[PDB]
Each structure stands twice: as structure tokens, then as C-alpha cells.
Design a protein around this nucleic acid. Structure first.
Lengths: 187, 174, 193, 154, 183
RNA sequence: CUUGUGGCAGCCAAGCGCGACGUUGCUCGGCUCUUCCUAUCAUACCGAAGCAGAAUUCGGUAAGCGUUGGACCCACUAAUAGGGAACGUGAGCUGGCCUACUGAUGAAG
RNA sequence: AUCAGAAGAAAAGGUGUUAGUUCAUCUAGACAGCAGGACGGUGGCCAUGGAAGUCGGAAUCCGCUAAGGAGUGUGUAA
């Protein structure tokens, strides 16, 4: 249980990821979510749209539309946000668009209990939050996609340098004569 | 967990009826006591022998003779519904006679929302001949060249940890 | 029930007097079959049903050496109760699909001729839609934009080729019969020539 | 234009080139369209779909098988309204099986109450005498207050 | 049922790769690539056989097999010898002016029933339009994929429509004549 | 709760003595206003209809935008649609403190 | 499930799905598919400008066969 953790949200389910996240926040862990666009919802795309046009129809509220603001709404329903226990738990949850620089250099963990592939029967209809919100009033679908591609270029380039580096240590690992004693201890 | 129960009993002998006949039943029940209750229900609705004039001579439990041998079971049942009468005959392939009935209770209450009291078991028989089998999926399961990937690939190996919140890598699941 | 009646009729046909004919039907219409049967009973029912009813084994079969003749016996053939007419007289009939066109018949452009120029009535208004060829029904008359060859020599009779030939006068067919052998009561020599 | 003016244009110019396969295509895919009708629509027009579907279903099954102090009730002559007053009844003869509008000569007895019988109020089951010369007491087999007509059986 | 197998005999082509649910099929005519992530299916390429297998699938997923098989047949025939869609023009009173631009990729139609609209159609990529001089008003639609050529034919048909009139009196328009391979 | 299908008497009558659909029988009240609903008056786009065209009728989506001036009427207009706010708005209208909303400043990281 | 799910309309409708029940054929070749035949008295008789099976009125008969319905629609004035 690190003080700060980063949850990649690509392929996670909005409802089942939030329930896991909401509990961790109440435990005191500073959870930061990234790539909130690629979240998923069970049900075909047009269905999740209509359940969202009901939200916009509900009016005096502030129908926040960005995918991070959709997820933050999901968590705010599983916290006691009226009390100062949840009001101080909401502020630890930082949900962002894509991966800002101060987090793209950090290891991103995934929740096994809320991934789309492990939780949906094959062939089931589902929608992507990023695409959905971009058809509800979001206006930054294209820019985040371009920025994500650029980071992918740098991250992939970073791996190739690291891949060769570990290959050198991979090639020099067997030179140690203690490998036999390593085998005897199973290490 | 059900058990096979061979239940044999007769009515109380009297001067009018000195030698009652020994009836026999192969009925299923989670315990010995439930077997008696189902016995009296099965017989009284049919043969009209009163509870208070009846005694039970022997309750025995029948372990599966050849549990390791795969078998196909034919199960005649009578559905009770809004109408209350349906001659339904289901077939299940498994290893234990009790296990087949368990699934039959599983399917009857799932596919058709039946209730244990409502459903009365008519007869459970073995189907030793593939020709005697009547179900295409069982017929296909009985083919010489059975082969299929393990379905529900995620259900295999699942996650395999105690409380694995925040796995550090994506699961292959393949 | 009908199959049993056909088998019974086949057995009676096998029990006929003589002439051991083997011919029931062909690509020719029922009128041609009736005309052929007029100079005589032709009946086949289901193909190979009579052979199956008779039995491949000689013991089951009423005839002799029917095991080899059963494989030879195929198509629309049947007994009857002649040789020169079958060998020589072959009534012409319109061709059907599956055969090869003897030549390359074509349809002239513009106004069409029902007799391929041997007359060309233009009253066949429903034929314009029923044709499907590149023809335009202008001023109440079908006009062909370009000439269309109905078929070609050495080419299989296509569905469109067969459809055009049905309306046209293309009798590129000749009836044939099979009399290789005779199932004589005494001789019992069904030659395979 | 004159007479069947569109029937010589078809005669002289020809038919819409693609009408027949379009109508054949429409006559085919309508089977899927009919089912999609019942799975989407709601309301009265869906309700009108229901019994009209069953009507042709049962009819099809038949052919293939063959293959203030005032009177609140109608009275006969409190306050009795003239509109509520009725003098003609479409009494249907039982044996004859012919329904005829006969004048209400009089009311024999009203089972509701003797006061209603005195007032000559027409009610269901009341006995009324009607002339049968053109063809006697008769019992009202309906409620004229709701049906709007004096329906009775001889 | 637990298994549902479909087999395909590969014609000449060049390559029929199923790399990552993406048939980048290359034939003698050319190369075409389509996605296959629309359905979850096992597609094995071996020898001269392509196996499409459904495991423990519902009838909804079972219906996708023949559709995919019909789909996979379309481009493999297209990449081998191509596909040609013959187009015929019928006009009642006003002759229709047809022009071809960028070697026919874009078709503009003019003088439609007195109307004065230069209806422009940018036909979808992979299909080009040509005017046949052998027969007048004959338009050839060449491509390597039926769904693209037919959709362009459907598009040119719907933009070639009549408004608020009687269909059985007006006959001008554009309509499908017939299909076929290039060779 | 309420909406678009009269009743009675028979003949049938799939079926379960009833018996559906069929069939016979003649027979308190209104001005302004604010919104909201669609069950659409017009306008938008479609379908069908003997739809030449013009003009017309029915039907489908459609509540975005409108839906009058004068004592049942008489003209314009594209039409002059129907309603609800259960004692519509009689504590807007007549006859037989605080909280809203609108505005105006405002100390503060 | 394009407003899923967590007695009132209620009778039924659904080319939605999974189970079953009762009947049918089926290597005498099941269904579908294409390939062809789908006849001749006869254009039966009234009915009519024109009705040849297909506007219409009672049957609606026969020879051939494995099968051609005085015809199931399309269609034509026919």
C-alpha cells in the first residue's frame, strides 16, 4: 500500500473500478487515475448515451462532461461526501485526461477485479467513455489522442534504450559462477 | 447435499390386516428425516395409507456403485405449475446418480423456477446406449472425436492470489 | 403409398409379354412421351426404385444376372409392350440447360423477331420485363440497344440461354432410347452393347 | 387527360423499370418488418395492431381448417325527463328470432320497487306489456339507462 | 452445439493473411485490408483451407460465420480478377449530363428533370467510374469490393430521385443494370 | 383511477355446461399571464391513395418555431390545434422576518 | 431490454432466445438450392365488346403417368 498509486484506466469498467477506488480513498491511499477516456460501460453505445441525456435533462445541477468528471461523479456516489470523512477523501482522488507528464514516468497498476475482458462475456455490447462524452459536449477528444500518440513515441523509444540495457545485464548474468548456488537455493 | 435412500415400510398390522405389504421407494433427501417426510407424501397422495397407522422397517443409503464410470441418466419428472401437471423427461450426463439429480434441481429451479416440494421425481434410469439417448448435445458429447478449448477462458486460472488489488501487469488470459 | 404403387407397376411391367423396352421419359415434354407411348406402358416413377425393389441380389431379383444390370440401369427408363422407330425416328424438341449449343445463335438489335427473321409481333409487353436483356420498350415496341448472342458453340446452355431458347425456335435436341439388351423370359440375355 | 389515361402510357411507354423487383423485394422483407412492428410500437396504435393481428390469425385458422327530486332512470308514460321517457322498445321474439321495435303499451311490474312500477320506470328485468298484433308481456333484458335503447326479449 | 466450422478454399490470390484480425489480402490485381475485430472468431490459415470456428456460441454469433464467409469471399475474388458494376441510364424528357473527374472518382450529374443542380458524388475510395462508349448511357463501376461499389450505386440511385411527383408517370433516373467480374 | 369499438337474443363455436373470433336478428365563466404535455392547426421531412400537373385526402417522425383583429358569426392570415397546473393562476384579475428571482458592491488565500 | 430488472389494463401479438411435449419424413437421397418437365379432351357450360385457369355463376369430369389443380398468383382487351 504505497502512499501514491496510479491506476491506468484503459479497459477498466467505470462502475467496478470506482467501487474499488472509493474504498481505497477512504482507507487513506492517494489514488490517481490516468487515461480516463478509455473507460468502459456495459451496454451498447446508444444506450449509455440516453442514460446520459437524462442527466442533462435533470436541471434545476452542473452536468460535468469530461471523462474524468464522469468518473469523479461515479466515485462521489460511493463516498460519504457530505461528511468531512468523505469530503477529505474526495480530494485525494485525482482523475486526469490521458497521462500528464508528472505521472507518465511512474509505473501504472491495473485492477484485476474490474478489467473489461475478465468481467464481460465475449461479444457483449459496451461503450468507451471517451467516445461517449465527445458526443455529449466534450470538445477535447482529438487533442488528447494526438498527445497520447506523442507520449507513446517517447515511451516506446525509452523502452528500446532500456531493453538493450537490460539485455547487456541479461548477457552478463550467466558469467557469475554463483549461478549453481543460485539454483540450489531456487533463486 | 442429497443422498440415495431406499425406504421400505408398511402399515401397522391389525386383526383385519395381519400381514401388510412392504412398499419400497428409491427417493432422494438431504437427511434421513426428510426421506420419511417425502415417503409419506409420495405414498399418501397415491395409495392413501395413513401416517399414524404406518411404521418404517428400514432406511438405507445407497452409495453410487460405479461412481468413476461416466454415465448418461434419464430422468422422468412431473412439473407442477399454474396448471400442475407436465410430463417432462430430462436427460443429464454425469458420474453419480445423486449428482445428476442435483443438476436437475439446479436446472429446474433455474430454467423453470421450480420448487422442491412442487417437483416430484418420477423415475431415474441409466441410459447405456447412445442410440437410446435422445438429446443432440448429449449425442454430440458422446461422439468419438470430442474436442473443444476450455470454455470461459477467464474462469481458468482466474486471478490466482489472495487479495490482488492493483496487479502490476495486464493478464494474458489466453 | 405412391412409391409402393410404382414398384408394383414396375413388377407388372417386368412381367409384361415381350419387347423388353427400356425407356420412360427424357427432356422431351409429356406430349412427346404420350406420342411415343401411343404406338404401344411407359412408367418409371422414382429412378432406381424398381431396381431397388427388384433387388441387386439375383435371388431377390425376378430376372437373372441383375446385379450387374442394376448399375447399368439408370435414368428415366421403363418397360413397355419399334426398334426401327427408336433407332431412326428422333422427334426434335427445344434444347434445355446442361447441353452444348450446336452453334452460336444471336439476337439482332433493334426490333426483335420471334421467329429469328423467319416471319415479329411486338405485343409481348410482359416479355420486356421478363427478359432481363438490354432491351428498351420504347413507343410500345421493345428495342434492343445492342445485339446479344443467345449461346455459342461448345458452351453449356446457360439459364438465360435456356430461357431465350424456350421462347425462340431452337429445337437443338433429339430423343434417344436405350435398347442394348432384352430381358427375354427364356433367353434372359440382356446385352450391354 | 381522358379515360384511363395512365393505362395507355403504360401501354405505349413501358413500366417503371425497377418496380416489379422493388415490389417483390417489399413483399419479401415485409415479414421482418411485421415482427419489428410489434417489438417497437406502444400505445393505442400498438393496441390496434394486437387484436387486428389476432383477427386475421383466427380467420386464417378457419379457412385452412375448411381447406333534486327527479327520476334518474328511463321511464314510460319526482320529475321524469321527457328525453328519459321512452315509448318504443326493440323487443326481440324468442321463437321467431326477429328483433322488432314495438311500442311500449304498458309496464306490467318493475322488480326494482313497486314505486318504480307505479312510475313506469324502465329497468332491467322489468315486465312490460307490448302489442303483438303485427307479429303480450316481455321482460327487459338490458339496461336502457346505459345502453341508450330499450333492449328486451319476448 | 459447441463447435461450428466453416472452410474456405483459397484461390490464386497472393496472400490472405489474417494478421491481427485484419485481412490484408493481396491478389494479382492488388492489395486490400479490412478489419475483423467486429466479431470474436477463430480464423486459421493453413495450406489451402481457412477455418472459421465458433466454440460454444449462441445463434447470434453463429449467424456471423456465414456473413464473414460471404464477406471474405468478396475481396478475395476482387483481388484476383476484380469486380465490375454495369450502370444504365433512363431519361424521360430532359437528357442527363454526366461528367467524370479525377479519372472518374467523382461524378457530377446535370440537367435532371429540368432541375439545375450539379449533383456531385465523391465516390468512395477503391471504386472508380468510367463511361462506356460501346453502348450509350452505359456506366462501368470497377472496384475490388462489392459493398463499396454497391453503396456508391445505392448513393447515386438515391441522389437520383423524384420529389412530390407520381412515380408511374416520370421515368427518368439511374438504376442498377447488372453485376459481374472484370474478367 | 382514466383514453377508440352499444346492448340483447340466437346460429355457429378453437377449445375448456360454458365457449373466443365470426354470423343472424331490427334498433359558474372568461380575460391576461407564466411555463409544461403531444393526443400536431400550420410550418420541416417522408409514405400511401387514379398521385398528368396544379391543387387535395389519409398516415409516419416531428413540440424547434408560431397559432389574430372586431360584435355563433366575417375577414385577414400559413393556421387561427387541444390541454394541464383537481376548488389553473379569486391573496394576477373581473363578470352572472426569512427565503426565492433580478440587479449592485464586496474582505479573502 | 433506444427509458431492462431488483394485482390494474391481463386477452393476446413478437422472423427474440433456451428448454421441452405431441406429430412427420429422411443414403427408396430429408429441407433448401439450382436443372427440366409442370401434358393432352378443353377456349368444359352459361356468363361478354373483350374472360383461353387466373372479372365472374354450380360442379370442376376425364386418357396418359412419378405428376400437370376446368388452375395459386403474376399478366394481357383477349
Amino acid at each position: 500500500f504505497q502512499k501514491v498509486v496510479v491506476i491506468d484506466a484503459k479497459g477498466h469498467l467505470l462502475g467496478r473500478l470506482a467501487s474499488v477506488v472509493a474504498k481505497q480513498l477512504l482507507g487513506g491511499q492517494k489514488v490517481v487515475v490516468v487515461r480516463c477516456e478509455e473507460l468502459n460501460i456495459s451496454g451498447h453505445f446508444f444506450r449509455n448515451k440516453l442514460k446520459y441525456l437524462a442527466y442533462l435533462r435533470k436541471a434545476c445541477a452542473f452536468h460535468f462532461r469530461a471523462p474524468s468528471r464522469i468518473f469523479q461523479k461515479a466515485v462521489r456516489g460511493m463516498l460519504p461526501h457530505k461528511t468531512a470523512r468523505g469530503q477529505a477523501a474526495l480530494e485525494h482522488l485525482q482523475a486526469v485526461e490521458g497521462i500528464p507528464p508528472p505521472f507518465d514516468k511512474q509505473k501504472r497498476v491495473v485492477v484485476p477485479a474490474a478489467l473489461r475482458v475478465l468481467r464481460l462475456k465475449p461479444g457483449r455490447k459496451y461503450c468507451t467513455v471517451g467516445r461517449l462524452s465527445s458526443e455529449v459536449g466534450w470538445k477535447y477528444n482529438d487533442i488528447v489522442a494526438k498527445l497520447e500518440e506523442r507520449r507513446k513515441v517517447k515511451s516506446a523509444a525509452f523502452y528500446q534504450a532500456k531493453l538493450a540495457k537490460q539485455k547487456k545485464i541479461a548477457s552478463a548474468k550467466e558469467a557469475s559462477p554463483v549461478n549453481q548456488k543460485l539454483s540450489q537455493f531456487g533463486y | 447435499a442429497l443422498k440415495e435412500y431406499q425406504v421400505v415400510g408398511r402399515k401397522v398390522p391389525t386383526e383385519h390386516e395381519p400381514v401388510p405389504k412392504l412398499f419400497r421407494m428409491r427417493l432422494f433427501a438431504p437427511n434421513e428425516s426428510v426421506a420419511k417426510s417425502r415417503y409419506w407424501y409420495f405414498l399418501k397422495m397415491i395409495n392413501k395409507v395413513k401416517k399414524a397407522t404406518g411404521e418404517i422397517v428400514a432406511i438405507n443409503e445407497i452409495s453410487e456403485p460405479k461412481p468413476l464410470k461416466a454415465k448418461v441418466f434419464g430422468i422422468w419428472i412431473r412439473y407442477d405449475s399454474r396448471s400442475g401437471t407436465h410430463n417432462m423427461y430430462k436427460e443429464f450426463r454425469d458420474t453419480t446418480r445423486v449428482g445428476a439429480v442435483e443438476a436437475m434441481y439446479a436446472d429446474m429451479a433455474a430454467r423453470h423456477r421450480a420448487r422442491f416440494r412442487s417437483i416430484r421425481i418420477l423415475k431415474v434410469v441409466e441410459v447405456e446406449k447412445k442410440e437410446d439417448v435422445r438429446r443432440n448435445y448429449v449425442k454430440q458429447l458422446l461422439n468419438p472425436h470430442l474436442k473443444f478449448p476450455l470454455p470461459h477462458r477467464r474462469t481458468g486460472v482466474v486471478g490466482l492470489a489472495g487479495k490482488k488489488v492493483f496487479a502490476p501487469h495486464r493478464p494474458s488470459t489466453f | 403409398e405412391g412409391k409402393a404403387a410404382l414398384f408394383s407397376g414396375v413388377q407388372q411391367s417386368l412381367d409384361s409379354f415381350d419387347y423388353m423396352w427400356i425407356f420412360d421419359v427424357t427432356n422431351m415434354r409429356n406430349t412427346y412421351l404420350k406420342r411415343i407411348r401411343d404406338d404401344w406402358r411407359i412408367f418409371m416413377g422414382k429412378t432406381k426404385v424398381m431396381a431397388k425393389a427388384l433387388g441387386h441380389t439375383p435371388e431377390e431379383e425376378h430376372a437373372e444376372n441383375v446385379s450387374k444390370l442394376t448399375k447399368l440401369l439408370h435414368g428415366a427408363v421403363g418397360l413397355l409392350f419399334v426398334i426401327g422407330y427408336f433407332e431412326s425416328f428422333v422427334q426434335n424438341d427445344f434444347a434445355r440447360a446442361g447441353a452444348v449449343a450446336p452453334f452460336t445463335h444471336v439476337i439482332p438489335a433493334g426490333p426483335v423477331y420471334s421467329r429469328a427473321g423467319q416471319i415479329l409481333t411486338h405485343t409481348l409487353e410482359p416479355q420486356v420485363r421478363q427478359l432481363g436483356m438490354p432491351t428498351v420498350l420504347k413507343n410500345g415496341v421493345v428495342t434492343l440497344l445492342a445485339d446479344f448472342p443467345l449461346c455459342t458453340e461448345g458452351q453449356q446452355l446457360d439459364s438465360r440461354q435456356t430461357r431465350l431458347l424456350k421462347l425462340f425456335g431452337i429445337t437443338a435436341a433429339e430423343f434417344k432410347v436405350g435398347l442394348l439388351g432384352y430381358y427375354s423370359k427364356k433367353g434372359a440375355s440382356v446385352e450391354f452393347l | 387527360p381522358q379515360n384511363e389515361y395512365i393505362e395507355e402510357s403504360i401501354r405505349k411507354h413501358g413500366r417503371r423499370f425497377d418496380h416489379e423487383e422493388r415490389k417483390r423485394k417489399k413483399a419479401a422483407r415485409e415479414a421482418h418488418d411485421a415482427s419489428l412492428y410489434a417489438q417497437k410500437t406502444r400505445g393505442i396504435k400498438a393496441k390496434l395492431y394486437q387484436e387486428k393481428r389476432r383477427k386475421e390469425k383466427i380467420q386464417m385458422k378457419k379457412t385452412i381448417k375448411q381447406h333534486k327530486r327527479m327520476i334518474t332512470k328511463a321511464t314510460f308514460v319526482f320529475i321524469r325527463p321527457m328525453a328519459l321517457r321512452q315509448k318504443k322498445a326493440n323487443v326481440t321474439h324468442k321463437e321467431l328470432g326477429v328483433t322488432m321495435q314495438l311500442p311500449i303499451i304498458g309496464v306490467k311490474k318493475n322488480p326494482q320497487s313497486p314505486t318504480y312500477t307505479q312510475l313506469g320506470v324502465l329497468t332491467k328485468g322489468t315486465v312490460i306489456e307490448v302489442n303483438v298484433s303485427e307479429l303480450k308481456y316481455a321482460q327487459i333484458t338490458n339496461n336502457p339507462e346505459l345502453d341508450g335503447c330499450v333492449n328486451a326479449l319476448l | 452445439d459447441i463447435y461450428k466450422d466453416e472452410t474456405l478454399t483459397i484461390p490464386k490470390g497472393v496472400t490472405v493473411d489474417i494478421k491481427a484480425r485484419n485481412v490484408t489480402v493481396t491478389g494479382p490485381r492488388g492489395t486490400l485490408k479490412q478489419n475483423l475485430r467486429h466479431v470474436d472468431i477463430e480464423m486459421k490459415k493453413q495450406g489451402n483451407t481457412i477455418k472459421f470456428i465458433v466454440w460454444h456460441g449462441s445463434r447470434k454469433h453463429n449467424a456471423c460465420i456465414r456473413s464473414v464467409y460471404s464477406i471474405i469471399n468478396n475481396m478475395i475474388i476482387g483481388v484476383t480478377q476484380g469486380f465490375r458494376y454495369k450502370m444504365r441510364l433512363v431519361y424521360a424528357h430532359f437528357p442527363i449530363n454526366i461528367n467524370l473527374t479525377e479519372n472518374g472518382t467523382v461524378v457530377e450529374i446535370r440537367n435532371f428533370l429540368g432541375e439545375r443542380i450539379t449533383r456531385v458524388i465523391k465516390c468512395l475510395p477503391g471504386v472508380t467510374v468510367s463511361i462506356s462508349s460501346a453502348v450509350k448511357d452505359e456506366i462501368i463501376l470497377e472496384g475490388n469490393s462489392l459493398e463499396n461499389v454497391s453503396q456508391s450505386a445505392a448513393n447515386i440511385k438515391q441522389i437520383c430521385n423524384v420529389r412530390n411527383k407520381d412515380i408511374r408517370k416520370f421515368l427518368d433516373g439511374i438504376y442498377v443494370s447488372e453485376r459481374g467480374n472484370i474478367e
